């Protein structure tokens, strides 16, 4: 197992800097309109790209989600997703030992339309890991 270890390691790497946000691990989330801007960490995929003759060498997708209230301008989302979260995770020594390689993939936004309650920005990482 690495997913619990991986998710734990990255959130700690984020929390070392100044706070200002909630750090919902896992997936069930459940926010309510008081625990706002917060960050979620989870994984998807987890296939069996063989790629090797000595270990399974699976790959997965690491998602970093930051949620902001409704219709705030994306400017802070750009600042949040580029400055708050990107440079800090750029080199986490715990992950380097934990994983085999880390690659950045995605940088997206998603505005709630029905009732327009929230606004989410997605940072996607592709992870090659062996478990």
């Amino acid at each position: 197992m690495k997913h619990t270890e991986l998710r734990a390691a990255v959130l700690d790497a984020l929390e070392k800097h100044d706070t200002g946000a909630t750090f919902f691990d896992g997936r069930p989330a459940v926010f309510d309109e008081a625990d706002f801007p917060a960050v979620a960490v989870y994984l998807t995929g987890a296939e069996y790209t063989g790629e090797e003759l000595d270990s399974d060498t699976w790959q997965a997708e690491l998602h970093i989600e930051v949620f902001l209230p409704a219709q705030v301008p994306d400017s802070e989302l750009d600042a949040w997703m580029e400055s708050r979260i990107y440079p800090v995770m750029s080199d986490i020594p715990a992950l380097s030992d934990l994983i085999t390689s880390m690659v950045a993939s995605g940088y997206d936004y998603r505005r709630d339309d029905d009732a327009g309650l929230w606004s989410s920005a997605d940072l996607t990482y592709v992870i090659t890991y062996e478990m």
């Binding site: 063989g50 790629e51 090797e52 003759l53 000595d54 085999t100």
Partner: protein
């Protein structure tokens, strides 16, 4: 961990002999062998035999080519692996290339079998791009007669072919189980054959050495069960009944 079933193939290991004794002696032993970690891909050197001409002026019609096997070549073995300069041993193999000596390496398959080659390194390269690890490319010129794992494999056979006798009650489909066991330590090269002497009143439906003898018509018959080897056989007594 049997060699008699098709193997998945994932999980094979690569080793290079480093001692001084004969690698062909105990290829199973890994004591004098360095494991090559992080093997991305492997390509064994194929075994090829040159075609030697044999046609002569004085013979019958030479309408069809007459060529025999000529000199045999062990080919070239290539593989790719993650670039690990800090590993101890990658320096050795490139130095092995640098010194240009002939050494021996073996491949341990995820089956319980190992094959060993002899040769010298011929091609070393590295491929580097972004969003993928740096890969090391190796190609080795195999030399001499190499040791196929088939030679290391042994043979178990003979001692005949046992059979469960009687079972002379065949009626209503029946398909009585029949076990043609093989005497030598169970482990044997099972090449047998069972077939009824009538093909109508009694018949055989062998499946995995477990013979199922069925019948429709009555009478008396004897079902022979023979070995593909041609010298060992068994015959069982069967008296099928209609009802």
């Amino acid at each position: 961990p049997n060699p008699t079933m098709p193997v998945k193939g994932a999980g094979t290991t690569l080793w290079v002999y480093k001692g001084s004794g004969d690698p062909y002696a105990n290829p199973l032993s890994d004591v004098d062998w360095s494991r090559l970690a992080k093997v991305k891909d492997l390509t064994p050197g194929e075994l090829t035999a040159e075609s030697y001409d044999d046609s002569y002026l004085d013979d019958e019609d030479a309408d069809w080519t007459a060529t025999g096997q000529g000199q045999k070549s062990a080919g070239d073995t290539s593989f790719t692996l993650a670039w690990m300069p800090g590993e101890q041993g990658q320096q050795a193999l490139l130095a092995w290339f640098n010194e240009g000596d002939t050494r021996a390496y073996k491949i341990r398959f995820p089956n319980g079998t190992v094959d060993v080659f002899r040769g010298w390194v011929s091609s070393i390269g590295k491929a580097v791009t972004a969003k993928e690890v740096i890969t090391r490319t190796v190609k080795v010129t195999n030399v001499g007669r190499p040791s196929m794992a088939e030679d290391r494999s042994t043979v178990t056979a003979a001692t005949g072919m046992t059979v469960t006798p009687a079972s002379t009650s065949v009626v209503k489909g029946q398909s009585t189980t029949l076990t043609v066991a093989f005497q030598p330590e169970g482990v044997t090269d099972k090449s047998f054959r069972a077939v009824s002497a009538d093909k109508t009143k009694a018949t055989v439906s062998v499946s995995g050495m477990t013979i199922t003898v069925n019948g429709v018509a009555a009478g008396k018959v004897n079902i022979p069960v023979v070995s593909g080897n041609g010298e060992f056989a068994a015959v069982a007594e069967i008296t099928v009944t209609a009802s």
